[PDB]
Design an enzyme around this catalytic site. Structure first.
Site, mmCIF file in Angstrom:
data_model
loop_
_atom_site.group_PDB
_atom_site.id
_atom_site.type_symbol
_atom_site.label_atom_id
_atom_site.label_comp_id
_atom_site.label_asym_id
_atom_site.label_seq_id
_atom_site.Cartn_x
_atom_site.Cartn_y
_atom_site.Cartn_z
ATOM 1 N N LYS A 1 26.778 57.673 64.986
ATOM 2 C CA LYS A 1 25.510 57.012 64.696
ATOM 3 C C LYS A 1 25.638 55.642 64.021
ATOM 4 O O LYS A 1 26.726 55.246 63.606
ATOM 5 C CB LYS A 1 24.640 57.974 63.879
ATOM 6 C CG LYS A 1 24.524 59.345 64.538
ATOM 7 C CD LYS A 1 23.511 60.258 63.844
ATOM 8 C CE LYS A 1 23.368 61.590 64.592
ATOM 9 N NZ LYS A 1 22.327 62.497 64.003
ATOM 10 N N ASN B 1 23.400 61.202 59.011
ATOM 11 C CA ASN B 1 24.510 62.137 59.037
ATOM 12 C C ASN B 1 25.706 61.788 59.920
ATOM 13 O O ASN B 1 26.375 62.670 60.458
ATOM 14 C CB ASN B 1 24.002 63.553 59.329
ATOM 15 C CG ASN B 1 23.486 63.719 60.737
ATOM 16 O OD1 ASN B 1 23.230 62.747 61.447
ATOM 17 N ND2 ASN B 1 23.320 64.968 61.148
ATOM 18 N N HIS C 1 26.831 62.921 66.034
ATOM 19 C CA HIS C 1 26.133 63.886 66.871
ATOM 20 C C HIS C 1 27.107 64.506 67.858
ATOM 21 O O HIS C 1 27.965 63.814 68.402
ATOM 22 C CB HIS C 1 25.062 63.224 67.717
ATOM 23 C CG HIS C 1 24.713 64.022 68.939
ATOM 24 N ND1 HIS C 1 24.045 65.226 68.867
ATOM 25 C CD2 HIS C 1 24.981 63.819 70.253
ATOM 26 C CE1 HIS C 1 23.913 65.728 70.083
ATOM 27 N NE2 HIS C 1 24.472 64.895 70.942
ATOM 28 N N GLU D 1 22.921 65.171 78.049
ATOM 29 C CA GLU D 1 23.156 64.010 77.200
ATOM 30 C C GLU D 1 24.073 62.998 77.872
ATOM 31 O O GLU D 1 23.837 61.794 77.805
ATOM 32 C CB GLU D 1 23.728 64.465 75.854
ATOM 33 C CG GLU D 1 22.703 65.225 75.026
ATOM 34 C CD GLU D 1 23.271 65.839 73.765
ATOM 35 O OE1 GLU D 1 22.477 66.393 72.977
ATOM 36 O OE2 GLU D 1 24.501 65.777 73.557
ATOM 37 N N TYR E 1 15.517 62.613 71.620
ATOM 38 C CA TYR E 1 14.871 63.419 70.592
ATOM 39 C C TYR E 1 13.492 63.925 70.994
ATOM 40 O O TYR E 1 12.651 64.184 70.133
ATOM 41 C CB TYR E 1 14.739 62.620 69.303
ATOM 42 C CG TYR E 1 16.048 62.314 68.626
ATOM 43 C CD1 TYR E 1 16.914 63.339 68.245
ATOM 44 C CD2 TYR E 1 16.394 61.003 68.303
ATOM 45 C CE1 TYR E 1 18.082 63.066 67.552
ATOM 46 C CE2 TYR E 1 17.561 60.718 67.609
ATOM 47 C CZ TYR E 1 18.397 61.755 67.231
ATOM 48 O OH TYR E 1 19.521 61.488 66.489
HETATM 49 N N1 LIG Z 1 14.757 66.665 57.343
HETATM 50 C C1 LIG Z 1 15.158 65.905 58.299
HETATM 51 N N2 LIG Z 1 15.082 64.521 58.165
HETATM 52 C C2 LIG Z 1 15.494 63.630 59.154
HETATM 53 N N3 LIG Z 1 16.003 64.026 60.326
HETATM 54 C C3 LIG Z 1 16.090 65.373 60.488
HETATM 55 C C4 LIG Z 1 15.706 66.347 59.570
HETATM 56 N N4 LIG Z 1 15.936 67.593 60.064
HETATM 57 C C5 LIG Z 1 16.459 67.367 61.289
HETATM 58 N N5 LIG Z 1 16.568 66.045 61.577
HETATM 59 C C6 LIG Z 1 17.100 65.390 62.827
HETATM 60 O O1 LIG Z 1 16.939 66.191 64.006
HETATM 61 C C7 LIG Z 1 18.199 66.384 64.709
HETATM 62 C C8 LIG Z 1 18.728 67.826 64.572
HETATM 63 O O2 LIG Z 1 19.401 68.311 65.784
HETATM 64 P P1 LIG Z 1 20.890 68.894 65.772
HETATM 65 O O3 LIG Z 1 21.440 68.370 67.076
HETATM 66 O O4 LIG Z 1 20.999 70.392 65.595
HETATM 67 O O5 LIG Z 1 21.586 68.159 64.560
HETATM 68 P P2 LIG Z 1 22.356 66.774 64.484
HETATM 69 O O6 LIG Z 1 21.613 65.777 65.428
HETATM 70 O O7 LIG Z 1 22.334 66.340 63.051
HETATM 71 O O8 LIG Z 1 23.707 67.101 64.991
HETATM 72 C C9 LIG Z 1 19.063 65.229 64.163
HETATM 73 O O9 LIG Z 1 18.816 64.077 64.991
HETATM 74 C C10 LIG Z 1 18.592 65.116 62.717
HETATM 75 O O10 LIG Z 1 18.833 63.847 62.089
#
Ligand SMILES: Nc1ncnc2c1ncn2[C@@H]1O[C@H](COP(=O)(O)OP(=O)(O)O)[C@@H](O)[C@H]1O
Ligand SMILES: Nc1ncnc2c1ncn2[C@@H]1O[C@H](COP(=O)(O)OP(=O)(O)OP(=O)(O)O)[C@@H](O)[C@H]1O
Ligand SMILES: Nc1ncnc2c1ncn2[C@@H]1O[C@H](COP(=O)(O)OP(=O)(O)OP(=O)(O)O)[C@@H](O)[C@H]1O
Ligand SMILES: Nc1ncnc2c1ncn2[C@@H]1O[C@H](COP(=O)(O)OP(=O)(O)OP(=O)(O)O)[C@@H](O)[C@H]1O
Ligand SMILES: Nc1ncnc2c1ncn2[C@@H]1O[C@H](COP(=O)(O)OP(=O)(O)O)[C@@H](O)[C@H]1O
Ligand SMILES: Nc1ncnc2c1ncn2[C@@H]1O[C@H](COP(=O)(O)OP(=O)(O)O)[C@@H](O)[C@H]1O
Ligand SMILES: [Mg+2]
Ligand SMILES: [Mg+2]
Ligand SMILES: [Mg+2]
Lengths: 137, 137, 137, 137, 137, 137
Positions: free
Chosen positions: A9, A112, A115, A126, A49
């Site tokens: 990211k 975070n 991905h 994807e 998303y």
């Molecule tokens: N509280 C939150 N605030 C901001 N973004 C969130 C929150 N909870 C979930 N997300 C977002 O939604 C997605 C979660 O999907 P997942 O694929 O399981 O996790 P990640 O994308 O972190 O690997 C991510 O893009 C994550 O940043």
């Protein structure tokens, strides 16, 4: 044969963590089948998303994922999808274990660092969404 | 502002040195303006080597540079062209000093792991040749 | 005082992971009481895996463990047997956690990079089987 | 084909630098043809130093080289003898450049962490002296 | 016995290079005799630069050195003053060799990440200026 | 805003692990709000471990924590207290998972390399106890 999509990211790229993260995957033994620095378009971010389109953090999420260049890639190898998922660690950095990518580099859920496709199906989707067919080697 | 073209050769990619090498450029403070895994075609390879054409090892070189995927990139930063030549070390690994990329990772000139633009002009030429304009960020 | 036997398998040696793995143990604080690059003889491999002599993967297992040189060693230190076992991670790389040796370097069960004595008794036995008495320092 | 003898001295072993040093040779691309932890005997030490015999520090050297276990090895690769001398850096740490083993890990010539054959002939002599033929792979 | 003063500048601290830099001095074998995060005051900065006073960039320097917290330290070891100057590399990053701190981490002389005493006398002067006597261990 | 107190104990300092450990925290993204090498006074050690004043290992504990210089610090960042606690790993090294600080560097409970505030309240208390108010930046 199996492939998974991974994305470093905007925060990870801005903090200069690309090589370090990529090294973990090469060290693991996965093959880089595709790689490119890219700017996520408003459209791509919304498609990616779509799942959380109704949620309240959606707007801020899209704004973050498009806030700067990201490094997109496709990793290849035995059970790479599940293994890469384990390597990244919990979505919420607070729950990500040390030795894990988010565990070692991320502090907040908003930014975070990385991905990784959640399943085989998510991966196929994807990959077609982020890369052009000829970009897979 | 100033920028240079860098290519991690097929040997560097198969030996899984992509991340480690990128990490050095990131810790150095250079900005990644472009990046992608790609397969160099026969024509492309030959076009890149226009002066080395009437030379000898030309075919043996093209053979190697097209022997597998390469990682192409553009790096930005103060005097980045000369700085990257210094970071890579001598073309022939035996003369490259420890601490440089070829000094720490390569043993033969045949497979010297990496390439970096010799001058700003070579860089512009190489960037236009290996990257489409929209791939520069 | 306590000692354990460790072996960096043929894959780990071929992939140039010996130093990296050994560094993890020195960093941990264990003492190297014995060390040597060696070729596992057909006999040694059969004795070592006598436990799985009846199994169906036995033939392929013996073929792998003797496919190339391995690095054998004995580590010394407090609870080294149990700690080294934890450091290596699950036998099946798919279940090995990140930060763990197999978790960071292995992808398949067949070629899982390293071996660590399972218990004190296994250690004593493996050590006498792989090293000559005078080789322990 | 060409090979050289390298010895991580007692100070290098007790400071836990074995893995880090081996890792540098592995990332460089050299092949480990022999490796073992060993205790140098008084006679052995003196035989190794045949010309430095009528010299002074001779006794103080033997004292140190036999002060604890050492890690002996043989490395293979193109021009590996000269290449390893370059990787180790100057004999006296103060003159060894950063990036070299002694430049990054040592501070005194007394305990300069490592030794590497000066010539191909010295290497053959050192290999025959520290390793039995069957230990070469 | 001999000691030197080292300062990781504001740029080095904000870029999160403190640990990596300290690690190099520790692996080298130097002893940390003093260490502390501190904010340089205007007066303090100017006192440190007594000869560079009638010079030009003086103000632009003070601005940077006081732009954020710095990490000050005293390192001990054989010829540590000259040795640390060698480890830092040339003042101007472009002339610093790969393997040195400025060669691997900096790109501009303006923000060249670190400072190290030029002589034993400068070191004593800098130590008395940045550290209280009781902070030396 | 949130802060936590961390201490690299005498063993960690003597083993030259300060930079490596500090690097993990910078890499994680936490801010260094305070830092200093210091000798724990008999009094400070007794206050800090007042909790275990009645226990039987108290005397040996105090003797260890004051056996040599320690590196004290305050880390700042989102949920830094809980995250730093997770990064350190279990108190008893035997139960600390790989990828964890104690998991990677400690072998015994007596000398477990590092300390991290257990809660927000413990942090506030430890910080005022180890640092002077003006030392927090
Ligand atoms: N509280 C939150 N605030 C901001 N973004 C969130 C929150 N909870 C979930 N997300 C977002 O939604 C997605 C979660 O999907 P997942 O694929 O399981 O996790 P990640 O994308 O972190 O690997 C991510 O893009 C994550 O940043
Ligand atoms: N004996 C050889 N065998 C194989 N390849 C060689 C040999 N000699 C030179 N080459 C190749 O020639 C090219 C050397 O380019 P040149 O001498 O013009 O400058 P350079 O800075 O080394 O360029 P480059 O970064 O592409 O290596 C490289 O592509 C290299 O691999
Ligand atoms: N003042 C000294 N104190 C202790 N040892 C010394 C001193 N001077 C030289 N030595 C020792 O002398 C030897 C130096 O060998 P020589 O000068 O012939 O070449 P070299 O390439 O340094 O060899 P080596 O790799 O064994 O160090 C080393 O074993 C070194 O530790
Ligand atoms: N063009 C410039 N722009 C900004 N700062 C400069 C410039 N030229 C020199 N400096 C500053 O001048 C000082 C250089 O000190 P000097 O040339 O006396 O020796 P030095 O070994 O480099 O000292 P230092 O370790 O403090 O850099 C540094 O503090 C540096 O940042
Ligand atoms: N499905 C399998 N395929 C190949 N080898 C296997 C399989 N299951 C177990 N083994 C082998 O049997 C041994 C298991 O013993 P154990 O000591 O517990 O694990 P490991 O040797 O991996 O540390 C290993 O040599 C392992 O490679
Ligand atoms: N068996 C033991 N031997 C020596 N010290 C112990 C023992 N059990 C606990 N301690 C000490 O008591 C403290 C435990 O408090 P805690 O803050 O939870 O752990 P730690 O200080 O290791 O992070 C530490 O200072 C630890 O060294
Ligand atoms: Mg080049
Ligand atoms: Mg030598
Ligand atoms: Mg300086």
């Amino acid at each position: 044969m199996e492939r998974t999509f991974v994305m470093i990211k905007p925060d990870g790229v801005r903090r200069g963590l690309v090589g370090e993260i990529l090294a973990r995957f090469e060290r693991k033994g996965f093959r880089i089948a595709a790689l490119k620095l890219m700017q996520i378009s408003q459209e791509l971010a919304e498609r990616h998303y779509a799942e959380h389109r109704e949620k309240p953090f959606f707007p801020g999420l899209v704004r973050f994922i498009t806030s700067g260049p990201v490094v997109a890639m496709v990793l290849e190898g035995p059970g790479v999808v599940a293994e890469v998922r384990k390597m990244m660690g919990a979505t919420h950095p607070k729950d990500a274990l040390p030795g894990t990518i988010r565990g070692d580099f991320a502090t907040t859920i908003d930014e975070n660092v990385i991905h990784g496709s959640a399943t085989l199906e998510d991966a196929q989707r994807e990959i077609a969404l982020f890369f052009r067919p000829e970009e897979l080697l």
